Structure formats: C-alpha cells, structure tokens
C-alpha cells in the first residue's frame, strides 16, 4: 500500500486542471499511485483556509477528483492552517472540520494537515491549554483524523520537517519527541530529508528519524523544486536516494518544477527508481526519460542531453555543462598567453557554444508549443549568456591584434543583466 | 489618423485570447486605438507562417477580431516570413497571399509584414531577380498591399529598424534609400528609435530618419519590453520621448512586458502621454491600479506598496527613487562597515525598515484577491524579497558579533565575465 508520485506543494502559479489531468494520465502510464494537492498560493489551501470553495470552484475540484479516481490515482487534499489558526478555540476547529467536510463531498477520501514554515510560538490563549507547540498541532490533528472517521491515507507535515529544522538536533527535539509519542499510528508523517532540498538521503538519517517519529515517513522530496530561484530549472535524474530506502519509507512524493512540462524527467526517473525495487542508475534512467520524452516534441536527442546537462540538479550540473564550465575557467585563467594549446581549445569551445545556439533554434522551431513555453525564458537565458561567453572568448583571442576593450560603444540593456535584484546580489561576498 | 496602442511583439509565451480581449477593454477605456499582432513565437505568425489556421484556431481568431471591432480598437495582423522565405518563388508568394486572405475572412482589414531580425543576404535565386536586399522586401510588400486592395492600414517593419542597425549610419544607408523611395507612399514604416531599446527618442533623430525614408515613422517602442532578461520587469512610467514627437510620427505602439498583468503602468502612462510628467503619470497609473487589488471576500495592499514595487522594477536605464535610495544606503553601509563614528547604526536601523517594507509588500500582495496579477509577478516579487531579506541579515552581520549555485549555470558563467556589474 506504498505511496509514490507528485506533490503540487510549491510557491507560485499553480497548475490548471488541464495540467493536473495530463499529470494523472502520466502517473498511471508510469505506475505511480498518488497526488498531494498542496499549492502554497491557491489561497483557499493556505492563505484563506477557513474559506469554503465557491460554486464554480466546487464544480472544478469535483471534476478533478473525478479524473483522479478515473485514473486510479489517489487524490490527497492538503490544508495549511498553520499561519493564523487558534488551536485552543473550538470555533476554529469547527471551521476546519466544515472545510474538510466540503471536500469530502467532492469524492475526496485522503487528507493532510501541513504545518510547515510557521512561527514557532503560539498566542496567549494557547499557552494555557497546551504545554507546547507540538501538543497543540497533534491534538488538533488527531481530533480531525477521528472526525473524518479515520480515513484511508492521512498525512501530517511537521514544523521541524527536516534535519536542519530540528531543534536543537534531530534526535533530541522536544517537538519531534512529542509528535512521535502522541500522533495517532494511522497518521503518516512527512519528511524532506536532512535539508529542505536534500542532496542525499542517507538511510542512517531515515533510521535516526524513524526512531523519533516512531514510524516510517513519506518523503516530501524537494529534489526538483525550482520555485526558490528564478533562473533555476531541474531536468536531472532522480538521484542521491538509495533504492534501499524503499523498504524503509512509507512513500515518496516529489515536489517538482513550477513549470509543468519541465517535470517529464523529474517524474519519469522517480517512476523507474520506484519500479526497480517495489541498484538503479541515475545516468541510465536519464537516458531512458530523454529518449521517451523526445517523442513529445528539428530537435535531436543530443539537444535534450545538452539541455538536461545545463539544468540538472540543485547541487550538480550535467556532464556536458560542467565540462563547458571547466573549459571556460581554464581559458580565462590561461588567457595571458595572448599559445598552441589555448587556441585549439578556444576553437573547440566556441563550437560547444554553437551547440547551445543550435539547441535553441531547433527547440523554437519545434511543434509542441506547450513545452516550448514552459521553458522558453530558461533556455533563452542560457543561449544569451553562452553567446556572450562565446563572444568573450573570441575577444580574448583577438587581444594580440587589437586593443579595443570588450564592450565597445553604448549598450543595449541586456549587456547588463539582472536589474536591481542583480545589483544587490553583486554586493554580497 | 494617428496610431497609438500596443504591439504584442515579443519573444516567448504569447498572450492568450482572453488576455488580448482584456487588452481591448483597457485600450478603449484609456482612449487608445490600436493593437498590432506580432508575437514572435506564436507558431503560425513566424516559424511556420506558411501553415493555415485550423477550424478551431479559425473560430478563435475571428472571435478575437470581432472583440477588437466591438471595442473600437483597430486590429492589425502581422506576419514574419523573412526567416526562410524565398522571394522570387511564386509558390511562396501565393502562400503569403493565401495566408492573408484567410485572415481577411476572419474580419481583418489591417496588415503588417515584418522583416526584423533576419540575415542581410539572400539565396542565389533571389540574388539576381532583385539588385539589393532592400529592393526585394519592398517588391513583395508592395505587391501584397495591392493584392488586398491597398487597405487603410498597412505596416512594414524594415531590417534596419533602428539607429544602431543602419549601415554604416542611418542618414546615409543604402538599405534605407531603397525603402524610402520604392515603398508605396501610402504604406507605413516601423522604427524603434536610436537603438532597439531607446533610452530617449530625440526629435532630431526622427527628422534624420524621416528624410531618408521620406515619411513619418510608426514607433515600435521597446521601452517596456522584458523578454530579454529573466530577472527584469518594467513597471515605470513611459519616459524619454518628448510630446513634440507626436506632430512628427504616424504612431506609437509599445512592446511591453511578457507578463500581461504587469503592463498596467506601461499602457496607462502611454495613454496619458498621448493626451507630460513621467512622475505625475506614474502616480495616476498606480492610483488607478490599486483598485484592481482587493482582499478576497470572506465568510469566516497599499499605494505605498505599489510605489515601492514600481521603484524596484522601473525602467531599463533607470531605477525608481526608493530603489536607488536603498541601493545608495546599502553601498554606504558596506563601505563604512569598518566602524564596527555613531551615525552608521542609526542608518543601519532605517535600512532594515526599508527591507521590512519589501517583505511587507510581498506579504500583502500574496493575500490579494486578484490572482491573475499575483501569478504574473510572482517570481519577480519573490526574488526581490529573498535577496532583500538576505541583504537585511547581512547588514546585521556587520552590526553583530556573528547559494554558490544561485542562478545555476547561467549565474555561474555570468559571474566570470568582467562586464558583470559594469553598471553599478
């Protein structure tokens, strides 16, 4: 009864129903079984969680929960009252029950309370009823669990939801201790790893946390999340989680890129990984996803290979991308020789830049316009920079026969990137 | 009759029909008259301009063209075939005419051929038929004009479309002479100014260009275009274009931000201008915009916030007063950090309050009822808030006793060019 698939749990523009349907379809195509609805900026999920869905919102949610069941995908509805709830006030608890009930009648069986990313104290009223913050959440969570009649799947996301976030440490936290103790055994606990965006999930970390949580956790995986960085996209393979974790977890739900179509790899390689141990090779799964993705788009598999390597993983570039970085660094470090070697590498380098240009022009000429659009700004960015980098390599080579400086004359605005934000960044060390 | 409005002419995700419709509402309400359809990455507009609209697309366009007529906005359909067209080939020409006619019957009466951003020479089969590149675009443009019966509005965007793009200069450019003289006296020419994003469009430059092309040009204004940088948005007032340019031009069409909702200022202030103080016009625009932001209705965002937002994402060549101010203050504090006579800390305190206001602005914007607007600006406002809060803390690090992948790969290469921060 193991849970694997997607959480829509990011900040930003949420997906539309047509995307969420195309999503379910893909999940079943690849044998995943679960979807957690938790978009941070759908205002009635978090910002105004007390509020009931309007008439047209109701029709939409129902149509969607339909399609979930129609595709045997388990639909889990999340709610994030963490910000401003009064735990001790019962009218508050009533409002929360009335809200969850309203969703119950859409066809919704699975539920989740999330208490991620909120102030660690409570109001004067609560300090009386509850001995700690931890108590308060648990008390309200259980109350709901039972009110729902102990439903099929029911998730809880704690405030200390990863290693960094446990105070003062992971295995000595009052908060996580009391959760382990008091949260009812049929309620599952969500965990993101040792960090918010975990590079690696050691089995030892899971073991250490399972002992305090007194159960196996479902991972909220932020591996492919790109909401915290405007320039960042992650088309790399699912990686840094041993296949040997599967028996030791209740699930993994991936929180992926905001841009729906960018998540092909992110979801595929998670499928492959789950289906391998229901080892696994990141390099190899990547090969599999890129080939099968290439169908959906003129554009070559090599162009995709390049693209994935340019936007790979939060802590890693792809082979072809890391290569270009080293090469540019050497070329700039050893520029002052302007002797036999340097130029051939520059010629070779200006070539690899060409491949980025070509990758862009073919992607723009492609037939799948939805996919283009999700990525357009991301790939135009790399094209722009690569062309300036090609240009700068050219200029460095031309130093022996010219004393003109790199930018000549008056510049168009894209000579100087980033606007105000970029200006404040350059002032940090 | 003078043309003023918006051109949807940028690279990236084009606006959807429902947004364009809303554009028509806004142009009329603000007493503007024109919309030039030219989205570079709409499929059938440019890359595969040869392909005819399906039945479903057909339904969608004429519905949109009807709406245009419904709101007394002149609809101009543009087409960008310059990429791989062969000029001499009749099959190509029929394909052009046939594409055009298909849109006529959708209810269209105004057209544009755009040749911006294409290679200067032709295929061998074109090299003999026409003496120069110019002669060759002119020919096909004229022919298309007459083919549809010399319609009321017809626009042509030249390859040398700005001061910098002309060889070896504007006033003495072969390509421009041929346009001026051989292009039919009743067709209009598009022009972006001295440069592609013109900081100013001075009067003298318009005289210099009108002489050589023999007519007053329509400005394609890129002042508010933001397609060329992920991190950039322009919510500042229409600026750098004297009201004295009006007598000397057939129109101004602004090419504005990719994110639809962000263009309220960009369009409102162009209107204001058309009827001039950049700061007075910003205030009028921000003031009217505030009303579009509500709290959502519940059964269980301020003007100073907008002023702050605009100052932070202002114009391509200029930050807004508050933005510059915080950037000055942050510079002085980082310079004078050695102190830790008295003053610095009194000023560190005021600065963390400014940062506070950025965080505040984001929070309130996050609770607003108009999610369309939020979503359009989200990643832009998120970014600024993250960086500010980090700048806030870092300022504190200096007071106290105590992302190498930021921007990913692109960020990393960018930090290796010397030209980074060549504008601070």
């Amino acid at each position: 009864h193991f849970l694997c698939g997607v959480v829509e749990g990011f900040y930003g523009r949420p997906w539309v129903m047509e995307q969420r349907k195309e999503l379910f379809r893909r999940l079943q195509k690849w044998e995943l079984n679960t979807y957690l609805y938790a978009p941070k900026d759908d205002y009635k999920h978090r910002m105004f969680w007390r509020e009931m869905y309007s008439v047209e919102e109701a029709e939409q949610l129902m149509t969607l929960i339909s399609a979930a069941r129609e595709y045997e995908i388990e639909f889990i509805y999340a709610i994030s009252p963490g910000l401003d709830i009064t735990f001790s006030n019962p009218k508050e608890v009533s409002t929360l029950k009335r809200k969850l009930d309203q969703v119950s009648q859409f066809g919704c069986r699975s539920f989740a309370l999330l208490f991620d990313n909120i102030d660690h104290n409570m109001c004067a009223a609560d300090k009386e009823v509850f001995s700690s913050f931890a108590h308060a959440q648990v008390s309200i969570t259980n109350e709901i669990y039972q009110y729902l009649g102990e439903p099929e799947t029911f998730l809880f996301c704690p405030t200390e939801y990863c290693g960094t976030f446990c105070y003062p440490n992971v295995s000595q936290s009052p908060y996580l201790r009391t959760v382990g103790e008091k949260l009812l055994p049929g309620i599952e606990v969500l965990w993101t790893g040792p960090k918010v965006v975990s590079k690696e999930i050691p089995v030892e970390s899971i073991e250490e946390v399972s002992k305090i949580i007194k159960r196996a956790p479902v991972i909220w995986d932020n591996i492919h999340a790109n909401d915290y960085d405007q320039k960042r996209l992650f088309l790399g393979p699912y990686k840094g989680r041993s296949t040997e974790l599967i028996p030791r977890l209740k699930g993994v739900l991936t929180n992926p890129n905001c841009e729906f179509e960018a998540n092909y790899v992110a979801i595929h390689t998670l499928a492959t990984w789950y289906k391998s141990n229901m080892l696994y090779s990141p390099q190899m799964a990547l090969k599999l996803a890129l080939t099968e993705w290439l169908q959906e788009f003129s554009v070559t598999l090599e162009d995709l290979q390049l693209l994935a390597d340019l936007f790979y993983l939060p802590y890693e570039h792809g082979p072809k991308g890391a290569q270009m970085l080293r090469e540019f660094q050497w070329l700039r470090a050893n520029s002052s020789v302007v002797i036999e070697e340097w130029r051939s590498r520059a010629a070779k380098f200006e070539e690899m830049c060409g491949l980025v240009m070509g990758m862009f022009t073919r992607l723009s000429n492609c037939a799948n316009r939805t996919i283009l659009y999700d990525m357009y700004s991301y790939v135009w960015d790399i094209k722009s920079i690569m062309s300036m980098v090609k240009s700068f390599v050219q200029w460095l080579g031309c130093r022996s026969h010219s004393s003109a400086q790199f930018l000549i004359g008056d510049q168009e605005p894209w000579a100087f990137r980033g606007g105000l934000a970029g200006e404040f960044q350059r002032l940090l060390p | 009759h003078f043309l003023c409005g918006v051109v949807e002419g940028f690279y990236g995700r084009p606006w959807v029909m429902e947004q364009r419709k809303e554009l028509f509402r806004r142009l009329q309400k603000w007493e503007l008259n024109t919309y030039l359809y030219a989205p570079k990455d709409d499929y059938k507009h440019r890359m595969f301009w040869r392909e005819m609209y399906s039945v479903e697309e057909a339904e969608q366009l004429m519905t949109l063209i009807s709406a245009a007529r419904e709101y007394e906005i002149e609809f101009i359909y543009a087409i960008s075939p310059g990429l791989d067209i062969t000029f001499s080939n009749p099959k190509e020409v029929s394909t052009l005419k046939r594409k055009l006619d298909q849109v006529s019957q959708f209810g269209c009466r105004s057209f544009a051929l755009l040749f911006d951003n294409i290679d200067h020479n032709m295929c061998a089969a074109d090299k003999e038929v026409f003496s120069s590149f110019a002669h060759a675009q002119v020919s096909i443009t004229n022919e298309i004009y007459q083919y549809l019966g010399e319609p009321e509005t017809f626009l042509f965007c030249p390859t040398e479309y700005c001061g910098t793009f002309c060889y070896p200069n504007v006033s003495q450019s072969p390509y421009l002479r041929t346009v001026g003289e051989k292009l039919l006296p009743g067709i209009e020419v598009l022009w972006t100014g001295p440069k592609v994003v013109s900081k100013e469009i001075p009067v003298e430059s318009i005289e210099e260009v009108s002489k050589i092309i023999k007519r007053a040009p329509v400005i394609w204004d890129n002042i508010h275009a933001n397609d060329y940088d992920q991190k950039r948005l322009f919510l500042g007032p229409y600026k750098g274009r004297s009201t004295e340019l009006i007598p000397r031009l057939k129109g101004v069409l602004t090419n504005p931000n990719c994110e639809f909702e962000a263009n309220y200022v960009a369009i409102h202030t162009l209107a204001t201008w058309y009827k001039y103080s950049p700061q007075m016009a910003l205030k009028l625009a921000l003031t009217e915009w505030l009303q579009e932001f509500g709290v959502p209705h519940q059964y269980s965002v301020t003007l100073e916030d907008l002023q702050l937002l605009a100052d932070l994402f202002y114009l391509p060549y200029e930050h807004g007063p508050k933005g510059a101010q915080m950037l000055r203050e942050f510079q002085w504090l980082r310079a004078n950090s050695s102190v830790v006579i008295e003053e610095w800390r009194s000023r560190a305190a005021k600065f963390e309050e400014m940062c506070g206001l950025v965080m505040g602005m984001f929070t309130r914007l996050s609770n607003c009822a108009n999610r369309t607007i939020l979503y359009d600006m989200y990643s832009y406002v998120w970014d600024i808030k993250s960086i500010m809060s980090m700048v806030k803390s870092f300022v504190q690090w200096l007071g106290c006793r105590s992302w190498a992948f930021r921007g990913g790969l692109a960020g990393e290469f960018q930090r290796l060019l010397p030209i980074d921060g060549a504008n601070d």
Partner: peptide, 4 residues
Amino acid sequence: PYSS
C-alpha cells in the same frame, strides 16, 4: 539573429 535576435534584436542583436
């Protein structure tokens, strides 16, 4: 090319 592009506007460049």
